[PDB]
Amino acid sequence: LLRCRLPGGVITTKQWQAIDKFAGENTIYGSIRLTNRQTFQFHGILKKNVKPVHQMLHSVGLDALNDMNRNVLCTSNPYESQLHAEAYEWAKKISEHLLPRTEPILGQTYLPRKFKTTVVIPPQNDIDLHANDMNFVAIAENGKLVGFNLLVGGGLSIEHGNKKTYARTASEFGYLPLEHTLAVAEAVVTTQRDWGNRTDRKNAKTKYTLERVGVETFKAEVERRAGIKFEPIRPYEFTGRGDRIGWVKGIDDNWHLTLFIENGRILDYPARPLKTGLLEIAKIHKGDFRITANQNLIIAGVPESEKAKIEKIAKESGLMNAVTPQRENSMACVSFPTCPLAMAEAERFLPSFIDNIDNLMAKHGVSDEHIVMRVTGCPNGCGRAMLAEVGLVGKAPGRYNLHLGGNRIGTRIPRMYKENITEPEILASLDELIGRWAKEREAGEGFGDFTVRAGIIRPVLDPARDLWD
Ligand code: SRM
Ligand code: SF4
Ligand code: NA
């Protein structure tokens, strides 16, 4: 397995052509796997190719640079298209500022655990901020960014039956002018580095450090170290976490074509040459591609005149095959056969599972609707099921824990509803549950909120204390 450092998921067509080639020739699987952290992975690199892979990444200006700072995410397709550039420039700066000097920031012993950061452009939460340690929520005025609201402490990983572990959402620290960004970023990393419990790795994460010392205590140290005082949180709202599948207008005569790629797995399948179609678009595309946090790919900045050009290839290659709004809002992790920590299938199970969910949605007359549904192959939480309305957490081969209760924007953790059950048992529950939502839901009420309001599942109000029954 090889993964790239790709801030904000922006990758050029030239770099793309380089990855399509290597993946095709130098890997067992021969596929490109877009991750939900806006980057790519190769699966099955032969040890002889471990050298040419780094060279290949480098020749195109890429790198794979662990208990370090992971890919810094950034909202991929904002409604106010102009805001992307400075947000993306900031995600890129934070990423570079947090890189190891090989360690004034990381420390010699580095970090207790992996540190995850994001730049969010409301009203979109496609990057799923509550799954991350440090979050920069962009505040704009007159089309220019002016500062960031800082949310710290997100994390989703749990351990089966271990009430000492839990998923936690990020806490609000305050508003910081744009100039204090790197200082604040640096301060959060260092206090976590110092305060973070290093002995027990399962308790090293920031979400744990925050619960032990307290948000306000953590906050004061961040202000002390940063040389600033946080200002009050400035109003921000989210409306969803999905991608804008299809064409959307960008700035000027620019357009963006977000392609839905199931499981982010790019490979040529019989009659659906996804991998070649993307190579073909890469060769004629004026611009970049953007890897979304929903494992999809955006063909960004297509001049209005080139729309038909690109659409012809995407269409012919099966890259624009129509899916239901449900499939578009469902996610799973890689899991088998490559993940060594896998307990239950995820990526290889999602497709057929969703076929089943689509039938249920149809059967209840809600086929134009969607439920944020995610399947994670083990509790480490890579598929982000702990921020979904319906989350399936793998417990053993063919058995998952069923969580319900999250919401569409992902600001609530789903409590466990049923435990260690199989697919036919999972579907029987959802058949009934969807049946009720379809008939009892209020105007525009999501499935998650319904289960909570209808007394179907108690909400998780304070993860550290009431996540576990
Ligand atoms: C590809 C991806 C899932 C996907 O289908 O997209 C992935 C895949 C794996 N993750 Fe992850 N993680 C991915 C996002 C995350 C997320 C979600 C997120 O960040 O948005 C989480 C949950 C949030 C969180 O971090 O709390 C996540 C929590 C973990 C953990 C639990 C860590 C912890 O703090 O307890 C592990 C295992 C570990 O680190 O000990 C892990 C471990 C793994 C490894 C690398 C397995 C391993 O340790 O050997 C998996 C690779 C399997 C494979 O063959 O691909 N992965 N993983 C994501 C790649 C991210 C990236 O490109 O940087
Ligand atoms: S959630 Fe578990 S099975 Fe799935 S990719 Fe992460 S470590 Fe592997
Ligand atoms: Na996808």
Coordinates of C-alpha atoms and ligand atoms in Angstrom, one line a residue:
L1 CA 0.0 0.0 0.0
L2 CA 1.2 3.5 -0.9
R3 CA -0.6 6.7 -0.2
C4 CA 0.2 10.2 -1.4
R5 CA 0.3 13.6 0.5
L6 CA -2.2 15.6 -1.6
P7 CA -3.4 18.7 0.2
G8 CA -7.0 19.5 -0.5
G9 CA -7.1 16.6 -3.0
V10 CA -5.9 18.8 -5.9
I11 CA -3.9 16.8 -8.4
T12 CA -2.9 17.8 -12.0
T13 CA -3.7 16.0 -15.1
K14 CA 0.1 15.4 -15.6
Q15 CA 0.5 14.0 -12.1
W16 CA -2.7 11.9 -12.8
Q17 CA -1.2 10.4 -15.9
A18 CA 1.8 9.4 -13.9
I19 CA -0.3 7.6 -11.3
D20 CA -2.5 5.8 -13.8
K21 CA 0.6 4.4 -15.4
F22 CA 2.3 3.2 -12.3
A23 CA -0.9 1.7 -10.8
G24 CA -1.4 -0.1 -14.1
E25 CA 2.0 -1.5 -14.5
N26 CA 3.6 -1.7 -11.1
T27 CA 0.8 -2.9 -8.8
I28 CA -0.8 -6.3 -8.2
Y29 CA -4.3 -4.8 -8.2
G30 CA -3.7 -2.3 -11.0
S31 CA -6.2 0.2 -9.6
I32 CA -6.3 3.7 -8.3
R33 CA -8.2 3.9 -5.0
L34 CA -9.4 7.4 -4.0
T35 CA -9.6 7.7 -0.3
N36 CA -12.1 9.6 1.9
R37 CA -9.2 11.8 3.0
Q38 CA -8.8 13.3 -0.5
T39 CA -5.8 11.3 -1.8
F40 CA -5.0 8.1 -3.6
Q41 CA -3.6 4.7 -2.8
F42 CA -2.0 1.9 -4.7
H43 CA -2.5 -1.7 -3.6
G44 CA 0.0 -4.5 -4.0
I45 CA 3.2 -2.7 -4.9
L46 CA 6.0 -5.3 -5.6
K47 CA 9.1 -4.6 -3.4
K48 CA 11.1 -4.0 -6.6
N49 CA 8.8 -1.1 -7.4
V50 CA 9.1 0.5 -4.0
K51 CA 12.0 2.6 -5.3
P52 CA 10.5 3.5 -8.7
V53 CA 7.3 4.5 -7.0
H54 CA 8.9 7.2 -4.9
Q55 CA 10.9 8.4 -7.9
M56 CA 7.7 8.5 -10.0
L57 CA 5.9 10.5 -7.3
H58 CA 8.8 12.9 -7.1
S59 CA 9.4 13.4 -10.8
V60 CA 5.8 14.8 -11.0
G61 CA 6.3 16.9 -7.8
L62 CA 4.5 14.5 -5.4
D63 CA 5.5 12.8 -2.1
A64 CA 4.1 10.3 0.4
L65 CA 5.4 12.1 3.5
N66 CA 3.0 7.4 10.5
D67 CA 2.2 9.1 13.9
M68 CA 2.3 12.4 12.0
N69 CA -0.1 14.9 10.5
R70 CA -2.2 13.1 7.8
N71 CA -3.6 14.6 4.6
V72 CA -5.0 18.0 5.3
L73 CA -8.5 18.1 3.9
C74 CA -10.3 21.1 2.2
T75 CA -13.8 21.5 0.9
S76 CA -13.7 20.5 -2.8
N77 CA -16.5 22.3 -4.5
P78 CA -17.9 25.3 -2.6
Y79 CA -21.1 26.9 -3.6
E80 CA -19.3 30.2 -3.7
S81 CA -16.7 28.8 -6.1
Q82 CA -14.3 31.7 -5.7
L83 CA -13.6 30.8 -2.0
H84 CA -11.8 27.6 -2.9
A85 CA -8.5 29.2 -4.0
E86 CA -7.6 30.8 -0.7
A87 CA -9.0 28.0 1.3
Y88 CA -7.0 25.5 -0.8
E89 CA -3.9 27.8 -0.4
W90 CA -4.4 27.7 3.3
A91 CA -4.8 23.9 3.6
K92 CA -1.6 23.6 1.6
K93 CA 0.2 26.0 4.0
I94 CA -1.1 24.2 7.1
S95 CA 0.0 20.9 5.5
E96 CA 3.6 22.2 4.9
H97 CA 3.8 24.0 8.2
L98 CA 3.0 20.8 10.0
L99 CA 5.5 18.7 8.1
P100 CA 8.5 17.1 10.0
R101 CA 11.8 19.0 9.6
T102 CA 13.7 15.8 9.1
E103 CA 11.0 18.8 15.0
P104 CA 10.1 22.1 16.8
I105 CA 6.4 21.3 16.1
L106 CA 6.3 17.5 15.9
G107 CA 8.8 16.8 18.6
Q108 CA 11.6 14.2 18.6
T109 CA 9.3 11.5 19.9
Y110 CA 6.9 13.0 17.3
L111 CA 3.2 12.6 18.1
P112 CA 1.4 10.1 20.4
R113 CA -1.0 9.3 17.5
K114 CA -1.9 10.4 14.0
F115 CA -3.1 14.0 13.8
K116 CA -5.8 14.9 11.2
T117 CA -6.6 18.5 10.0
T118 CA -9.1 20.1 7.6
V119 CA -10.2 23.5 6.1
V120 CA -14.0 23.7 5.8
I121 CA -16.0 26.1 3.7
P122 CA -19.5 26.2 5.1
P123 CA -22.3 25.3 4.4
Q124 CA -20.5 22.2 3.2
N125 CA -19.1 19.6 5.7
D126 CA -18.1 17.1 3.0
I127 CA -14.7 16.8 4.7
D128 CA -16.5 15.4 7.8
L129 CA -14.8 17.7 10.3
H130 CA -15.9 15.8 13.4
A131 CA -13.6 13.0 12.4
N132 CA -10.6 15.3 12.8
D133 CA -8.3 16.7 15.5
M134 CA -7.9 20.2 14.2
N135 CA -10.4 22.0 12.0
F136 CA -10.3 25.4 10.4
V137 CA -13.8 26.6 9.5
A138 CA -13.4 29.4 6.9
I139 CA -15.2 32.7 7.7
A140 CA -15.6 34.8 4.6
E141 CA -16.8 38.4 4.0
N142 CA -17.2 40.1 0.6
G143 CA -15.7 37.0 -1.1
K144 CA -12.4 37.2 0.8
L145 CA -11.6 34.9 3.7
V146 CA -11.0 36.8 6.9
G147 CA -10.4 34.1 9.5
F148 CA -11.2 30.7 10.8
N149 CA -13.3 29.2 13.6
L150 CA -11.3 26.5 15.3
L151 CA -12.8 23.2 16.2
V152 CA -10.5 20.7 18.0
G153 CA -10.8 17.1 19.2
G154 CA -12.6 15.0 16.6
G155 CA -11.9 11.3 16.3
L156 CA -13.9 8.2 15.4
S157 CA -11.9 5.2 16.4
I158 CA -13.3 2.9 19.1
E159 CA -12.5 -0.6 20.3
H160 CA -15.2 -3.2 20.5
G161 CA -16.5 -3.5 24.1
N162 CA -13.9 -1.0 25.4
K163 CA -15.9 1.7 27.1
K164 CA -12.6 3.6 27.6
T165 CA -12.5 4.4 23.9
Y166 CA -15.1 6.5 22.1
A167 CA -15.8 8.6 19.1
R168 CA -16.0 12.3 19.8
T169 CA -17.0 15.3 17.8
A170 CA -14.8 18.4 17.6
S171 CA -15.2 21.2 20.2
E172 CA -15.4 24.9 19.4
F173 CA -12.4 27.0 20.6
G174 CA -13.1 30.3 19.0
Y175 CA -12.4 32.6 16.1
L176 CA -8.9 33.5 14.9
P177 CA -7.9 36.1 12.4
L178 CA -6.3 34.7 9.3
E179 CA -2.8 35.8 10.3
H180 CA -2.8 33.7 13.4
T181 CA -3.5 30.5 11.5
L182 CA 0.0 28.8 11.5
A183 CA 0.6 29.9 15.1
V184 CA -2.6 28.4 16.3
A185 CA -2.1 25.2 14.2
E186 CA 1.4 24.9 15.7
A187 CA 0.1 25.5 19.2
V188 CA -2.6 22.8 19.0
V189 CA -0.1 20.2 17.7
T190 CA 2.5 21.0 20.4
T191 CA 0.2 21.0 23.4
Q192 CA -1.3 17.7 22.1
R193 CA 2.3 16.5 21.7
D194 CA 3.1 17.4 25.3
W195 CA -0.2 16.7 27.1
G196 CA -1.2 13.7 24.9
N197 CA -0.9 10.4 26.9
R198 CA 2.0 8.5 25.2
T199 CA 2.1 5.4 27.4
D200 CA -1.3 4.0 26.4
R201 CA -1.6 4.5 22.6
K202 CA -5.4 3.8 22.7
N203 CA -5.7 7.0 24.8
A204 CA -3.1 9.2 23.0
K205 CA -5.6 10.9 20.6
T206 CA -6.5 14.6 21.2
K207 CA -10.2 13.7 21.9
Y208 CA -8.9 11.9 25.0
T209 CA -6.4 14.6 25.9
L210 CA -9.3 17.1 25.7
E211 CA -11.5 15.0 28.0
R212 CA -8.8 14.6 30.5
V213 CA -7.6 18.2 30.8
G214 CA -10.8 19.9 29.6
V215 CA -11.5 22.1 26.6
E216 CA -10.9 25.4 28.4
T217 CA -7.6 24.3 29.9
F218 CA -6.5 23.1 26.5
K219 CA -7.7 26.4 25.0
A220 CA -5.8 28.6 27.4
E221 CA -2.5 26.8 26.6
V222 CA -3.2 27.1 22.9
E223 CA -3.7 30.9 23.4
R224 CA -0.6 31.1 25.6
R225 CA 1.6 29.3 23.2
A226 CA 0.1 31.0 20.1
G227 CA 0.4 34.5 21.5
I228 CA -3.3 35.2 20.8
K229 CA -6.6 35.3 22.6
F230 CA -9.5 33.6 20.7
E231 CA -12.4 35.8 19.7
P232 CA -16.0 34.6 19.9
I233 CA -17.1 32.0 17.4
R234 CA -18.5 33.7 14.3
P235 CA -21.8 32.2 12.9
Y236 CA -21.5 29.2 10.6
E237 CA -24.0 26.5 9.5
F238 CA -23.8 23.4 7.4
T239 CA -26.4 22.0 5.1
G240 CA -24.9 18.7 3.9
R241 CA -21.8 16.5 3.3
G242 CA -22.4 15.3 -0.2
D243 CA -20.6 16.1 -3.4
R244 CA -22.4 18.0 -6.2
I245 CA -22.6 15.1 -8.6
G246 CA -22.8 16.4 -12.2
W247 CA -22.0 19.8 -13.6
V248 CA -22.0 23.0 -11.5
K249 CA -20.8 26.4 -12.5
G250 CA -17.6 27.7 -11.2
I251 CA -16.1 31.2 -11.8
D252 CA -16.1 32.8 -15.2
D253 CA -16.9 30.2 -17.9
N254 CA -15.5 27.4 -15.7
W255 CA -17.6 24.4 -14.9
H256 CA -17.0 21.4 -12.6
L257 CA -18.0 17.8 -13.3
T258 CA -18.0 15.7 -10.2
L259 CA -18.0 12.0 -11.1
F260 CA -19.5 9.5 -8.8
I261 CA -16.9 6.7 -8.5
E262 CA -18.2 3.7 -6.4
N263 CA -15.8 3.0 -3.5
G264 CA -13.4 5.3 -5.2
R265 CA -12.0 2.3 -7.0
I266 CA -10.7 3.2 -10.4
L267 CA -10.1 0.2 -12.6
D268 CA -11.3 -0.8 -16.1
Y269 CA -14.2 -3.2 -15.7
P270 CA -15.9 -5.0 -18.5
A271 CA -17.8 -2.3 -20.4
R272 CA -17.0 0.4 -17.8
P273 CA -13.4 1.5 -18.6
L274 CA -13.3 3.9 -15.7
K275 CA -9.5 4.0 -15.5
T276 CA -9.0 4.6 -19.2
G277 CA -11.8 7.1 -19.4
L278 CA -10.1 9.1 -16.7
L279 CA -6.8 8.8 -18.6
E280 CA -8.5 10.0 -21.7
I281 CA -10.0 13.0 -19.9
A282 CA -6.7 13.7 -18.2
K283 CA -5.1 13.9 -21.7
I284 CA -7.5 16.6 -23.0
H285 CA -8.5 18.3 -19.7
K286 CA -7.5 21.9 -19.2
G287 CA -7.0 21.8 -15.5
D288 CA -6.9 19.8 -12.3
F289 CA -8.9 17.0 -10.9
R290 CA -10.0 17.1 -7.3
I291 CA -10.2 14.0 -5.0
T292 CA -13.2 14.5 -2.8
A293 CA -13.7 13.3 0.8
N294 CA -16.6 11.1 -0.6
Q295 CA -14.1 9.2 -2.7
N296 CA -15.3 10.8 -5.9
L297 CA -13.4 12.8 -8.5
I298 CA -14.0 16.3 -9.7
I299 CA -12.9 17.4 -13.2
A300 CA -12.4 21.0 -12.2
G301 CA -12.3 24.2 -14.3
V302 CA -13.7 22.9 -17.6
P303 CA -14.2 25.8 -19.9
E304 CA -17.9 25.9 -21.1
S305 CA -16.7 25.1 -24.6
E306 CA -15.1 21.8 -23.4
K307 CA -18.2 20.5 -21.6
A308 CA -19.3 18.2 -24.4
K309 CA -15.8 17.0 -25.0
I310 CA -15.3 15.8 -21.4
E311 CA -18.9 14.6 -21.1
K312 CA -18.6 12.5 -24.1
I313 CA -15.7 10.5 -22.6
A314 CA -17.1 10.4 -19.0
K315 CA -20.4 9.2 -20.5
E316 CA -18.9 6.6 -22.8
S317 CA -16.6 5.2 -20.1
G318 CA -19.4 4.6 -17.6
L319 CA -18.2 7.5 -15.4
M320 CA -21.6 9.1 -15.5
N321 CA -23.8 6.1 -15.1
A322 CA -26.8 7.3 -13.1
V323 CA -27.1 6.1 -9.5
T324 CA -29.7 6.7 -6.9
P325 CA -29.2 9.6 -4.4
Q326 CA -28.7 6.8 -1.9
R327 CA -25.7 5.2 -3.5
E328 CA -24.3 8.7 -3.9
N329 CA -24.5 9.3 -0.2
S330 CA -23.1 5.9 1.0
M331 CA -19.5 5.1 1.9
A332 CA -17.4 2.1 3.0
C333 CA -13.7 1.6 3.7
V334 CA -11.3 -0.7 1.8
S335 CA -11.3 -3.6 4.2
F336 CA -10.6 -6.9 2.6
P337 CA -8.6 -8.1 0.8
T338 CA -5.8 -5.7 1.6
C339 CA -6.5 -4.4 5.1
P340 CA -4.8 -6.6 7.7
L341 CA -7.1 -5.2 10.4
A342 CA -10.3 -6.1 8.6
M343 CA -13.1 -8.1 10.4
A344 CA -16.0 -7.7 8.0
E345 CA -16.2 -6.7 4.3
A346 CA -16.9 -3.1 3.5
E347 CA -15.8 -2.0 0.0
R348 CA -16.7 -5.4 -1.5
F349 CA -20.0 -5.5 0.4
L350 CA -21.3 -2.0 -0.2
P351 CA -22.4 -2.3 -3.8
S352 CA -24.8 -5.2 -3.3
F353 CA -25.8 -3.9 0.1
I354 CA -26.9 -0.6 -1.5
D355 CA -28.7 -2.6 -4.2
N356 CA -30.8 -3.9 -1.4
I357 CA -31.2 -0.5 0.3
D358 CA -32.4 1.0 -3.0
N359 CA -35.1 -1.7 -3.2
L360 CA -36.3 -0.7 0.3
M361 CA -36.2 3.0 -0.6
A362 CA -38.2 2.2 -3.7
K363 CA -40.6 -0.1 -1.8
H364 CA -41.4 2.8 0.6
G365 CA -41.6 5.5 -2.0
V366 CA -38.5 7.4 -1.0
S367 CA -36.2 6.5 -3.9
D368 CA -35.3 10.2 -4.5
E369 CA -34.3 10.4 -0.8
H370 CA -31.0 9.4 0.9
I371 CA -29.7 8.3 4.3
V372 CA -26.0 8.9 5.0
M373 CA -25.1 5.2 5.2
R374 CA -21.6 4.0 5.9
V375 CA -19.9 0.7 6.5
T376 CA -16.6 0.5 8.3
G377 CA -14.8 -2.9 8.2
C378 CA -13.5 -2.8 11.8
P379 CA -14.0 -0.3 14.5
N380 CA -10.9 1.9 13.6
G381 CA -13.6 3.8 11.8
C382 CA -12.1 4.5 8.4
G383 CA -15.4 4.4 6.6
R384 CA -16.6 7.1 9.0
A385 CA -19.7 5.2 10.1
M386 CA -19.5 6.9 13.4
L387 CA -20.8 10.1 11.8
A388 CA -23.4 8.5 9.6
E389 CA -27.2 8.3 10.1
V390 CA -26.9 4.6 9.7
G391 CA -23.5 3.1 10.4
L392 CA -22.4 -0.5 10.2
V393 CA -19.3 -1.4 12.2
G394 CA -17.7 -4.7 11.3
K395 CA -17.4 -7.2 14.2
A396 CA -16.6 -10.4 12.4
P397 CA -17.0 -12.0 8.9
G398 CA -20.5 -11.0 7.8
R399 CA -21.5 -9.5 11.1
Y400 CA -21.7 -5.8 11.9
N401 CA -22.9 -3.5 14.7
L402 CA -25.8 -1.3 13.6
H403 CA -25.6 2.3 14.6
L404 CA -28.4 4.8 14.1
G405 CA -28.9 8.3 15.2
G406 CA -26.4 10.6 13.4
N407 CA -27.6 13.3 11.1
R408 CA -27.2 14.6 7.6
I409 CA -24.5 17.1 8.4
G410 CA -22.5 14.8 10.6
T411 CA -22.5 16.6 14.0
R412 CA -23.9 13.7 16.0
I413 CA -22.5 10.2 16.8
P414 CA -24.8 7.2 16.1
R415 CA -25.5 5.1 19.2
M416 CA -25.4 1.3 18.7
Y417 CA -28.8 0.0 17.9
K418 CA -28.2 -3.7 17.3
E419 CA -25.0 -5.8 17.8
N420 CA -23.1 -8.5 15.8
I421 CA -25.9 -9.1 13.2
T422 CA -25.8 -10.3 9.6
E423 CA -26.9 -8.5 6.4
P424 CA -30.4 -10.2 6.3
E425 CA -31.0 -9.1 9.8
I426 CA -29.6 -5.6 9.1
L427 CA -32.0 -5.2 6.1
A428 CA -35.0 -6.5 8.1
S429 CA -34.4 -3.7 10.7
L430 CA -34.0 -1.0 8.0
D431 CA -36.9 -2.2 6.0
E432 CA -39.1 -1.6 9.1
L433 CA -37.3 1.6 10.1
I434 CA -37.4 3.1 6.6
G435 CA -41.0 2.1 6.4
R436 CA -41.8 4.3 9.4
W437 CA -39.6 7.3 8.3
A438 CA -41.4 7.3 5.0
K439 CA -44.8 7.6 6.7
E440 CA -44.0 9.5 9.9
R441 CA -41.4 11.9 8.9
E442 CA -41.9 15.6 9.0
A443 CA -41.3 17.9 6.0
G444 CA -37.7 17.4 5.0
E445 CA -36.7 15.4 8.1
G446 CA -33.8 13.1 7.7
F447 CA -33.7 9.5 8.8
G448 CA -31.2 10.1 11.6
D449 CA -33.2 12.8 13.2
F450 CA -36.3 10.7 12.8
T451 CA -34.9 7.7 14.8
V452 CA -33.9 10.2 17.5
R453 CA -37.2 12.1 17.6
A454 CA -39.4 9.0 17.3
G455 CA -37.7 7.4 20.3
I456 CA -36.1 4.7 18.2
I457 CA -32.6 5.4 19.4
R458 CA -31.5 7.6 22.3
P459 CA -29.1 10.4 21.1
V460 CA -25.4 10.5 22.0
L461 CA -25.2 13.9 23.7
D462 CA -21.7 13.7 25.3
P463 CA -19.7 10.9 23.6
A464 CA -17.2 10.5 26.5
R465 CA -20.0 9.8 28.9
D466 CA -23.2 8.5 27.0
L467 CA -22.0 6.8 23.9
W468 CA -21.9 3.3 25.5
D469 CA -25.0 1.7 27.0
Ligands
SRM1 C1 -8.3 4.4 2.7 C2 -8.9 4.7 4.1 C3 -10.5 4.2 4.1 C4 -11.2 4.5 2.7 O1 -11.8 3.5 2.2 O2 -11.1 5.6 2.2 C5 -8.1 4.1 5.2 C6 -7.6 2.8 5.2 C7 -6.9 2.2 6.3 N1 -6.7 2.8 7.5 FE1 -7.7 4.4 8.2 N2 -8.2 4.9 6.3 C8 -8.8 6.1 5.9 C9 -9.3 7.1 6.7 C10 -9.3 7.0 8.1 C11 -10.4 7.7 8.9 C12 -11.5 8.6 8.4 C13 -10.9 10.0 8.1 O3 -9.8 10.3 8.5 O4 -11.7 10.8 7.5 C14 -10.4 7.2 10.2 C15 -11.4 7.4 11.2 C16 -11.2 8.7 11.9 C17 -10.1 8.7 12.9 O5 -8.9 8.8 12.5 O6 -10.4 8.7 14.2 C18 -9.3 6.1 10.1 C19 -8.8 5.4 11.2 C20 -7.8 4.5 11.2 C21 -7.3 3.8 12.5 C22 -7.7 4.0 13.9 C23 -6.7 5.0 14.4 C24 -7.0 5.5 15.8 O7 -6.7 6.6 16.1 O8 -7.4 4.6 16.6 C25 -6.3 2.9 11.9 C26 -5.4 2.0 12.6 C27 -4.3 2.6 13.4 O9 -3.9 3.8 13.0 O10 -3.9 2.1 14.4 C28 -6.3 3.0 10.5 C29 -5.7 2.2 9.6 C30 -5.9 2.0 8.2 C31 -5.1 1.2 7.2 C32 -3.9 2.0 6.7 C33 -4.7 -0.2 7.8 C34 -3.4 -0.4 8.5 O11 -3.2 0.3 9.5 O12 -2.6 -1.2 8.0 C35 -6.1 1.0 6.2 C36 -5.5 0.6 4.9 C37 -6.3 -0.5 4.3 C38 -6.1 -0.5 2.8 O13 -5.7 -1.6 2.3 O14 -6.4 0.5 2.2 N3 -7.2 4.0 10.1 N4 -8.8 6.0 8.8 C39 -8.7 6.2 4.4 C40 -7.4 6.7 4.0 C41 -7.1 8.1 4.6 C42 -6.0 8.8 3.9 O15 -5.8 8.7 2.7 O16 -5.2 9.4 4.6
SF4_2 S1 -12.0 0.5 9.2 FE1 -10.7 -1.2 9.7 S2 -11.0 -2.6 7.9 FE2 -11.7 -0.6 7.2 S3 -9.9 0.2 6.1 FE3 -9.9 1.0 8.4 S4 -8.5 -0.5 9.4 FE4 -9.1 -1.5 7.5
NA3 NA -17.2 7.6 -4.5

